[PDB]
């Protein structure tokens, strides 16, 4: 209701109408960068001045129904002119507040939780003082996942986190990656955040490499402790220890009803046709399949038609 009424008056103005009508979805990120370039007015001093004031931070309206206005001391915790609250409110919440189970945390932040396990169950050796020469290689800071390239990691993340905004590819192939099923089964009722989960999954599944002047181990485990092993004139020895087939027939038709959503293609039929919104705005007409249409030797069989 609010978003549509906010969209309605933007097209009232002539200058914004040209932007909204002449810009394709492919160019949103281009115009997103035209914001500003001057903000650094000594942030440390600003924060020091802002922490002196009472009520320096903001919160939602429903805080007034969960946190009392005053504590046993008799100090005000929030004030009414989003509302304004004080750090004492955060400390009060950490002291008294509702509790919920945290069983989903070790599966969303497991890449961080493996580091502590590696560090605690490790042993140390002696330190040697001498001079050494360091040469450069290609090092991997994120190992990634085996049997998965960078093309399908994004597909997996999109399917798990944003099931309603997949398009074209992933929607016409006839397969289902195994890891997707377990990721969707485990994260059934997690309410942390879509964006945080997406970033954590990207960090877990995607491999990325850089250049470093390493003079010791090459594996990913030895790169994360590179500030502890090497130095200007010393070396420390340390061991770690341890989705059905569909096709596009054309654009939207006015003789086959209104458009649907991707999650509502489940009912469907055995070869009817309906229009749906796929991706970030495209509406196309689709239909179920009747054959295989695979990538077997039939592609190579065309060689019989040539070189007779």
């Amino acid at each position: 209701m609010e978003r549509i009424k906010e969209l309605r008056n933007l097209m009232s103005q002539s200058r914004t109408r040209e932007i909204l009508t002449k810009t394709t979805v492919d160019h949103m990120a281009i115009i997103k960068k035209y914001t500003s370039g001057r903000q650094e007015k000594n942030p440390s001093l600003r924060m020091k001045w802002m922490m002196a004031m009472k009520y320096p931070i903001t919160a939602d309206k429903r805080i007034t129904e969960m946190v009392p206005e005053r504590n046993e001391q008799g100090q005000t915790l929030w004030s009414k002119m989003r509302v304004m609250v004080s750090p004492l409110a955060v400390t009060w919440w950490n002291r008294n507040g509702p509790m919920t189970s945290t069983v989903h945390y070790p599966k969303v932040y497991k890449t961080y939780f493996e580091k502590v396990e590696r560090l605690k169950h490790g042993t140390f050796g002696p330190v040697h003082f001498r001079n050494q020469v360091k040469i450069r290689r290609r090092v991997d800071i994120n190992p990634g996942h085996a049997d998965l390239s960078a093309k399908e990691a994004q597909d997996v993340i999109m399917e798990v986190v944003f099931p309603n905004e997949v398009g074209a590819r992933i929607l016409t192939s006839e397969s289902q990656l195994t890891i997707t099923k377990e990721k969707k089964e485990e994260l059934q009722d997690c309410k942390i955040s879509p964006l945080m989960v997406a970033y954590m999954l990207e960090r877990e599944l995607v491999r990325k490499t850089r250049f470093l002047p390493v003079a010791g181990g090459t594996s990913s485990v030895y790169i994360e402790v590179l500030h502890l092993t090497q130095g200007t004139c010393w070396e420390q020895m340390y061991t770690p220890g341890g989705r059905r087939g569909f096709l596009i027939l054309g654009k939207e038709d006015r003789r086959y009803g209104p458009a649907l959503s991707i999650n509502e293609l489940s009912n469907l039929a055995k070869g009817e046709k309906a229009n749906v919104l796929i991706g970030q705005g495209d509406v196309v007409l689709v239909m179920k399949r009747k054959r295989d249409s695979s990538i077997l030797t039939d592609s190579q069989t065309a060689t019989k038609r040539i070189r007779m």
């Binding site: 914004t16 002449k22 979805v25 492919d26 990120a29 994004q154 999109m158 964006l195 970030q280 705005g281």
Partner: peptide
């Protein structure tokens, strides 16, 4: 003026904050 149009887009498509959108139509 560009920022308003940008911020109005994610309210319809929340995945725009994670990766760049792809499409052939206009915003409206």
């Amino acid at each position: 003026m560009y920022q308003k149009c940008c911020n109005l887009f994610e309210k319809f498509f929340p995945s725009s904050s994670y990766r760049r959108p792809v499409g052939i139509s206009s915003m409206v």
